[PDB]
Amino acid sequence: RPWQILSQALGFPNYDQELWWQNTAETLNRVLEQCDYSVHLQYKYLAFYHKYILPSLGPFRRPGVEPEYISGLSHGGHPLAISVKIDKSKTICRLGLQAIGPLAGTARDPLNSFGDRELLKNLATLLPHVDLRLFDHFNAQVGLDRAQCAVATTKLIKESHNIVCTSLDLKDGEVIPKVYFSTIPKGLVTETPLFDLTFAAIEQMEVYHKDAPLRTALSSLKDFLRPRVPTDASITPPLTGLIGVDCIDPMLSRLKVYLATFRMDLSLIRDYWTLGGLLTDAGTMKGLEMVETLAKTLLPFGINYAMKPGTAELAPPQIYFPLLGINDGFIADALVEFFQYMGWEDQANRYKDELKAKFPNVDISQTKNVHRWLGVAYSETKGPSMNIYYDVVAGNV
Amino acid sequence: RPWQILSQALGFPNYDQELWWQNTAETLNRVLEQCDYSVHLQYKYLAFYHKYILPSLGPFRRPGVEPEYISGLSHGGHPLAISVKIDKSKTICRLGLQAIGPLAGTARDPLNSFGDRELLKNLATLLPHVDLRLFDHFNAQVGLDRAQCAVATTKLIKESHNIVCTSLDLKDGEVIPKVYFSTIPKGLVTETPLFDLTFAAIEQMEVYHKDAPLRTALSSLKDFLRPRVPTDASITPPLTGLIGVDCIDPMLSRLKVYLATFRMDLSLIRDYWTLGGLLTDAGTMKGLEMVETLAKTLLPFGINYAMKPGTAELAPPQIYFPLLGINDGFIADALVEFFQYMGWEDQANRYKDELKAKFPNVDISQTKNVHRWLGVAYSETKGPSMNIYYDVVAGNV
Amino acid sequence: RPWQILSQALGFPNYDQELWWQNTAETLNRVLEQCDYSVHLQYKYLAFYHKYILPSLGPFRRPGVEPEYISGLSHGGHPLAISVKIDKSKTICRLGLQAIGPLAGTARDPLNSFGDRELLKNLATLLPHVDLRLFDHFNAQVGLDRAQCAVATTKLIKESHNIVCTSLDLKDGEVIPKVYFSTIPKGLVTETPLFDLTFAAIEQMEVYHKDAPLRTALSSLKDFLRPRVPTDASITPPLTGLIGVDCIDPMLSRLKVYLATFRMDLSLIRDYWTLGGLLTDAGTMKGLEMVETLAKTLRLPFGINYAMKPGTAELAPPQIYFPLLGINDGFIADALVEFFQYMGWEDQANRYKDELKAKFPNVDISQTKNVHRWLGVAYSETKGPSMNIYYDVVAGNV
Amino acid sequence: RPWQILSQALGFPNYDQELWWQNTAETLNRVLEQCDYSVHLQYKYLAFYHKYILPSLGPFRRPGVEPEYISGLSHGGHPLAISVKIDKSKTICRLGLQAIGPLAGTARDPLNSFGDRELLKNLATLLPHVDLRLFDHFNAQVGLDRAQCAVATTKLIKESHNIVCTSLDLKDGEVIPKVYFSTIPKGLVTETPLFDLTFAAIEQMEVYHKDAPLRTALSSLKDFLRPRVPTDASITPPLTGLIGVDCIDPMLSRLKVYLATFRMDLSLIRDYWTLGGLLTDAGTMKGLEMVETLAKTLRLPFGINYAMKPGTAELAPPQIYFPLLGINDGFIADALVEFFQYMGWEDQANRYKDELKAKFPNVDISQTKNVHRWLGVAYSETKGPSMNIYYDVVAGNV
């Protein structure tokens, strides 16, 4: 009901917003039920979704209507994904989007440079613990003027006309925002190595100057990345495509460096997970078993090197496997095997039924688009985790 | 929580809307709890309140800030009241307002002629059973152009610069809108008897031409009213001040004619309740006992003659007693006596505690503003009812 | 330049408004120059267009993007027309549109029942002389609820999913709004003779009760129309399709009853122009010559508009509207020139064609058959003769 | 007339915008006429003002209505100023404001942290040459979170509850945005020398890393400033209060470091103008004469603005700003005239006073002490000499 009561109570300012609801709210409400969120938080997150996210989602692509802006975040072209973060004992719901501006994909705003900032400006008046300083920093570092954006669109596919995209964790009672920034556009227009802009942009952060542990960690990473990535201006995998940050106090925020690569295998998994033998402790290795097992039980691959200040030691990345094009029925079973392997019996026994329940307009045995990415993680304190990124819209036709 | 979760989830577009919430949402949420509305309807009605009513409420009058528009609906000047309709076994929650336009009280819109229509235009896209035909009819009949509105403001007190105000019943799962239209402005500017415009406006309704029962009832009423009210253009009590309609299919809607009067006593109660001996059956009389008892157990008085099509027989009115200036503690006790008298023991045992619970920022023993009006009613099928109109804001300082 | 300064100063809230301006504003500006509107009035009217009309125009239909709402006001489906009203000595510019609501053509608003009322509500705060009472009246008499609107859409072509459209006279420093209301939807849904509801709705106007001259004129018109139009619920020509009003003081507003009809010839022109021999004065007959001459000098219905002002019991000849959808605009240009000479309007004759080319320079008139859309003709006792020409701006800009 | 046509065409979304226009637009229009801006540019700039600036101005403070947010940019508390920049031969018009957000001065937005960024975001869709990278940079370096903003408000007068304000050059057909960022809030909250953060924030600019000339110029400036300003967290004169930038390509933008100071005299003028004997060329010294003469010809701080462009290692004399709040505007008019004669600007001298009266006709200049608010003076090698005069429009309209 909560999605229905809110539709009933709030209606819709235009038809596209209505279409968004009708293809994402039921699933979202479902996901929240399945994660054992309370009714009050179901309303909280859905009300929020309605007010702030619907308008940010732009037009709804569909037969007959072709937006000027087209997103990479999904197969149909829609700037939305819902993911979950699965733990031993709990599941968290997360939203991913690009906030579409009303002139995006036109001369006036080729790369959708404004809307994500506008969304967050609103979340800053809404939420008390939201912080725009890291955003503003990287936006300054990797943003482009109109003429530059225009150039960038002549050398990029329609799907990748973008500098920034946004995430929202529905964590505890809260909305935690995260933004990821693309270096590729600037790299292309300035003809600058991606490595160079990535670390130039990072080295100029306020946090960086005042936190020697971080500064150290970065060096470890630079030294490991330098040989593995291009030292010229090519877009040759593996590359430093994305920079990610949490929209909170800079000192407390994780700084994420992401690699994009098409070639993945056992040696490379190892190379990435351990940073070229740099990591060899028990945990690093227990986590390495995880990931190899997952790969055996089975768009670029993605390696995410996350870094928190007041900490000089790097840690294993999170590794992200593309699933686009692979049957969702098989994946459902795969993930169940792997959940059993991890000793997550509850998660194994419910995954597939619940998956069906998230996306009832579809038969997963015949779809290859709904599971889009999956990432895996190992932590010392928190231990293991899996993030699964779904294409809500694909799962709602 | 529901008022808090929605504040948390939705925030506020400007400060005035925030102030409205902080002085009306808690009370509203409370009232709904007390009427045994379900959580899903608590959210429904509160979400709706947030989206559509907050913006319509205009500025929030307060020390330091004096809106150009000032409402008659409340003591502080705020265009809002919450009322309840108390039955034998149940209670319904109702909202009353004027929808403030962004230029209201200025040259461009002296009488706030537009905002109520704009609100309802939105409720028409929201709700499927909302109907604007009766509105448009009476708005056409009693509305005024800019120059006329300007004139009307030079001959009316600041509190009465208005043609229309709106009501919303939170009934079952629904929002049922009602509008009341003021004849006084047109009467003043056109120097036309109020009686004449009131019935001229009524006689030109589509329903009227096609429904001989109604046409008959109206005649009974006209004949009864004609001697009791002014036949010239004065504003002399009793007068035909307000015309009211339900915003549904014209055939199904109750047409309400309201009298305003300052002189009330036992004979006049009788005169009004029975329409000058016209009504003498058992029910009319059982209802007459009710009302005399209520008056004994204790702004103009108000008499509301309601009329439905496909029905030629008039019925007793609903009579409305002003409470402004009378201690709310006394009234609380009064209403309890009268609830006991009616054999509504449950309602008697809870009124005062619940009243305190609606308005905890206040001590009712010392306030004379919170209970504002009270109306009483008798029906054949539905039987007896009491509507109590509160000044939420007054009850929230 | 004025259209370009305003584009420079205001930009656009979204792309559709940009497209609308890009296919629309140059022409509008040009038309104003050609009509000898001052620079300050050019800005006035273009600024107004930007703020108030662009947002009302909805999406801009175009390859790849198919709005949910499709308008009958133009060939491409765009809810916009620019017309002009030509006199002996002066020309004035007018705009015609439907104001598109954001849910128009969907379950929530099938017949676009709200947007025009919103636009006018905004003109009511803008302009001091705008009056919504007649609009509200006919919107009450002829408007439909959601469920009704839905029924109506299952019996009407996409192009006619509409109750009302709006017009705006750009007349001597001001914007005069007019609205036209369609009787068809309510006819279909209620299964009621169009005649009966047209006149029921008119017979309940406040004006009508307090103005016996009008009450009379109306009777004349009915007496003439009754035999000529269906007495049943059919939608058969000639029919009372549109009721029109000026959005000003009711006592000062013209009430307009429109007929649609496909069959037109010389006996019929005469019949409509004179109201069945009822009119025989010199002016009537000079007007008849005017009109007949126009028909001789030359798919959508013909339109007859019977206008009536209050405090007047005597009917007057209608204005007759000729459809030009499908006929070469190169010919029409030449046709209109002959007729301008014939009327003794040498200046208008010597300019028409060149100035037409100049309104619509992305197009060859010689090749197009959709730019000139209508043309109406009028005789008045005082003002004299008048030609209104309705263009399809968008059609003239692709 | 242009201000009146636009009011006629656009009306107003709410009353505050109306009031803003009614106390504001006549003057602006007049200033443009006096500066010989063409009619089309008058419309351009006034149309732009209507659409983009009015809504940004927030409520209009006035008897009975007390906004939650109170601005330091004017005497009445209104966040608006019109300035003018006077040359030998031409004058240009500029606007200064804070863009007021709808929760500004409340828990949710104590320091008005968002509205200027929103305004610029809208200018970025409007104008092609607007660039937000420097803005974003300093907003990152010098901006504060909600809790921080709250702390800052408990140590600052209502009038200074602000991080940023905005300016707009109406220069040869375009709108050039500039923003100024206040270092004080972050100083107070972090308890950090203003000097240290001013230069930390500057030392992290992208430009700075890739431009050794700038890196150098900056060093010169620091070397001069270091001894002259506090080395502790105090807010004591002279202080590095404002960092300014032009919202264009970083490589092309002037970085401006402002000093505030209450003590000014002839040794100090010299000291600031030359940077402690560091500058001794002919131009420097002719500028010094210019300035000294101005001080001789004559409560808010004095302002020194050190501007620096990239690809330039050599500093240049600042522009010095004299507060005029409290001093009769009748005198100032006469004062400015002397000085115009002294500069050899006869035309500017012969017009100033009359044209001033003409900007502000609801007022007697003779009687007012708040309309002229600041005046800054400048010497350039190429452009030459320059006077910027900052007016309080609202103060000149009540």
Ligand SMILES: COC(=O)[C@]1(Cc2ccc(O)cc2)OC(=O)C(O)=C1c1ccc(O)cc1
């Ligand atoms: C005779 O033509 C018309 O009245 C209309 C509407 C109109 C009216 C006035 C005006 O200045 C511009 C357009 O002009 C059109 O292009 C067009 O399609 C009109 C119209 C209106 C209603 C209708 O049933 C058919 C056409």
Ligand SMILES: COC(=O)[C@]1(Cc2ccc(O)cc2)OC(=O)C(O)=C1c1ccc(O)cc1
């Ligand atoms: C020297 O004066 C100024 O820069 C300001 C801001 C300003 C800047 C440019 C412009 O065209 C108009 C106003 O003009 C004012 O009226 C005013 O109050 C300004 C200002 C800015 C910041 C500050 O700390 C004090 C004043």
Ligand SMILES: CC(C)=CCC/C(C)=C/CSP(=O)(O)OP(=O)(O)O
């Ligand atoms: C570069 C490629 C191909 C994929 C990266 C995918 C991506 C942006 C993952 C973010 S996971 P994230 O939302 O950040 O989850 P947590 O940090 O909380 O573990």
Ligand SMILES: CC(C)=CCC/C(C)=C/CSP(=O)(O)OP(=O)(O)O
């Ligand atoms: C004219 C005076 C003084 C008071 C009238 C008060 C008023 C507008 C009452 C409406 S009661 P109402 O909301 O209409 O309740 P029901 O018809 O459902 O019984």
Ligand SMILES: CC(C)=CCC/C(C)=C/CSP(=O)(O)OP(=O)(O)O
């Ligand atoms: C029903 C058909 C086919 C045509 C009617 C066309 C119509 C609504 C024309 C507008 S009449 P109008 O613009 O109002 O012209 P004027 O009376 O101002 O001279």
Ligand SMILES: CC(C)=CCC/C(C)=C/CSP(=O)(O)OP(=O)(O)O
């Ligand atoms: C800190 C104090 C007291 C004054 C500084 C005043 C200030 C911000 C003036 C604007 S400088 P600006 O408008 O940018 O003038 P130009 O450099 O364009 O000649």
